[PDB]
Amino acid sequence: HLKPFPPEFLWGAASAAYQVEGAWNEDGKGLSVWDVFAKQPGRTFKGTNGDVAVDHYHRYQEDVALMAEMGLKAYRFSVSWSRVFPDGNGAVNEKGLDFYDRLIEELRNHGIEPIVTLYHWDVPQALMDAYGAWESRRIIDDFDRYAVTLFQRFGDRVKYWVTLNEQNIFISFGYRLGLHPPGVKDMKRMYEANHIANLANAKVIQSFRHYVPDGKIGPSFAYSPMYPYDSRPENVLAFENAEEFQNHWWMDVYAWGMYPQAAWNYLESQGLEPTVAPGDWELLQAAKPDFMGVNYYQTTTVEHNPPDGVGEGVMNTTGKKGTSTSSGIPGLFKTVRNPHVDTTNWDWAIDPVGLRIGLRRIANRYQLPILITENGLGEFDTLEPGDIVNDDYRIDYLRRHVQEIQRAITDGVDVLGYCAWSFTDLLSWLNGYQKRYGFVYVNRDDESEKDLRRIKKKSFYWYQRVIETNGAEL
Amino acid sequence: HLKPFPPEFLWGAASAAYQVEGAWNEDGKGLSVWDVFAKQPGRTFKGTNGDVAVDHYHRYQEDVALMAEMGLKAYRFSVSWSRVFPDGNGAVNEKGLDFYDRLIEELRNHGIEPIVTLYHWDVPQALMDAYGAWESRRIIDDFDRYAVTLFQRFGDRVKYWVTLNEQNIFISFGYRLGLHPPGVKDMKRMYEANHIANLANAKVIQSFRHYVPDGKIGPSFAYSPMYPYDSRPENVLAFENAEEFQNHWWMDVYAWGMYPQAAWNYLESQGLEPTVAPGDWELLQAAKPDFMGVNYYQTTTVEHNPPDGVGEGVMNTTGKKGTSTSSGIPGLFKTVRNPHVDTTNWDWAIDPVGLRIGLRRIANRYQLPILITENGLGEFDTLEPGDIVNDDYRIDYLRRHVQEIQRAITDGVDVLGYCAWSFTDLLSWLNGYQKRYGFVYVNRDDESEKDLRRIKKKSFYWYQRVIETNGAEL
């Protein structure tokens, strides 16, 4: 017998500024590292970039109206740092703030709760130029100044805040895999910047307590819960290493202010552990969040990986199902296909039970409320005659995940809300437009920009009915 | 490249008073619940009881000389509460204290560190008679009076103390399975007695901080780390349930003073959650131990268990392999044979890597030092002519477990010592005498005490060499 979703459950949907806004150089916006990076040839699919994206900066009023039509309880978006401080640390750009003000007012005028993400991977290029951005402790006070600017301006209207979105992704992709700005493949630098981002997170949560005392704040972690392949003890040990190295490495810092000891010792034995200054641990331990943000898409099954074995594997860029290969850390673990779940054509696991598991793991380990900040299915959508997009695949994925959330809530996990990814179709960081996540289809592809018109998918009306029946009808 | 065992590592061996001492009615000792229980017909194998056991009460000087020959760094034993307080809470039996004094003096005169266990399952019968022993809050102050009696008498000479030995066993065998005193099969009463024992534990740790400010104290948990059968999401979820319900339920209280939420809510949904009084959480949270004691023998693998599925299973007390059957909690999990490890004739899994996994889990979750208070192999031994016992099976088991301990130390786990179960052969609570654990064979069986003579097994000389080389030679 399931509990119902609490009466004030934030039924949400989410975006990211670079992925949706466009207007990349209007009203005084400075350059972000993604403005620069995406124009480098060969980085992104068929050269797609966020110059225009889906032009939400100009079309937000149409977008919020569709949200109100849908009946969204909440909308999560990120603020573009380079719209607010074109220099990163220089003078405030009033026009930048004014856009987010207009957006927030528009949201509230329709009874939609704003959830403001501070950082979704678009640090101003100037800070990378001036001092290497996340590799310098200077970004801690510059990021604080930016966050306090937003707290003072919108705190009276915004209850829910997310600090760093998927810090493990932009640190890892940006400094170990070289797929994100700054395009580095250096684990020593990766863990130095990661440590500085941890301090940045902690500093702004401390500021938030001062400036928005009645608000709620937390980081948002890209969580792939780990599985052992089987009950072979070496495979279970590989799972212990994988969950600690991939997940606790970040979530323990967010929740407890300390790195896990085994992973630290392994990094130390390699000279990879970050530099620590007096006052780091106290700051990290003094910044307890109100919730853990969770971006969830899939789980990961691992097995034993000998000292000889797998390192970086092949990511699935194409959509040809089966093209991924195992990634691992030699001596600790390597990934392996989970034979008991389906995958998308990008080899992403479809594992809605895995979300319940991950929600139970966070509650069991940290006793924190959880805000699900991202969950969605990316697939090709066909526009059929009569403005009909039948994305039954997307409905099927979202339904099973929402069902497992309800089971998690019945187990006792405190889930604050759920933000589907995404509200409209948007630009993928590297893969363009054809892998769509939206409830609302946007009329463009990789070649033709067309008119960017919004078209309600079938999933839009499915989810309209979910919010209407507070989840009782799925 | 492995870290060495630290220089003051406690290379130990262990026993329990009812299993070893005998002298059940000598020198003013009162009846314990096990004196009474084991003499009820059908409770124990061939009617074996602890009237004589292996008569360590009279033979402790010989046994300590053998420990010294082996070069034992530490000896862990339990104190028999009914020797000290014959009626549990009245006047002290000075002859009872005087035995443990002579024992501790004998250990110290041979340079062996005593590790005193306060409680190994033998509460005096008079407290069971007066108020039902662990089922009444009366036991909190009675157990405290007894603990403080020991702290004041021996605290000058005993640094390391264990409070409750395997609370999860004597509570669940005593109140859920009905296999131990008081022979109850009632889940509601089980969780009430369990909660009272948590309070008694915390209360004596509080007293210890006053009376033995330089000592180290912890409870000892019977730890079987859980494994999922495979990467099927329903089986990983059964693993999350199993590890929380069987393991976190006790260790979270010990380390954090808190029950885990999902397990609590499932018990509450069944009317089984314990009665909580004002001040309970305050006491439980304010009694941090210096270390987590760990009794480890095996891991347990689990799979999905439907709501109509498995409950109590068949236990193996005969010694014929393949007799055990699945046990579980309907709707949460059930056990299943791990196909990737061997088992003993009593169906206990042989999983030395599981010990590394369990030590890693404790350090990862609680960041506590660990004292391994029990680990060993129970098997039939053959006394061959010339008083020779070749127990290579025991050496093989201890060697691989000690090997995995070193890997855990190298990972960063703070292991304070290792107490092999057991120093001499002793009485098994239910299984009689033939399932032997000792380094030292004792010449007796289930039908005759014979001459109770002590005979060093082959594993005696193996462990002697382990200690002489501080574990460099295994």
Ligand SMILES: O=P(O)(O)OC[C@H]1O[C@@H](O)[C@H](O)[C@@H](O)[C@@H]1O
């Ligand atoms: O590469 P894909 O399939 O388009 O997935 C990208 C999505 O994956 C998530 O990791 C990001 O938080 C989103 O910003 C992004 O939209």
Ligand SMILES: O=P(O)(O)OC[C@H]1O[C@@H](O)[C@H](O)[C@@H](O)[C@@H]1O
């Ligand atoms: O294998 P057996 O004979 O059932 O014994 C298990 C042993 O290990 C633990 O369960 C107990 O702490 C010991 O007291 C007991 O001797």
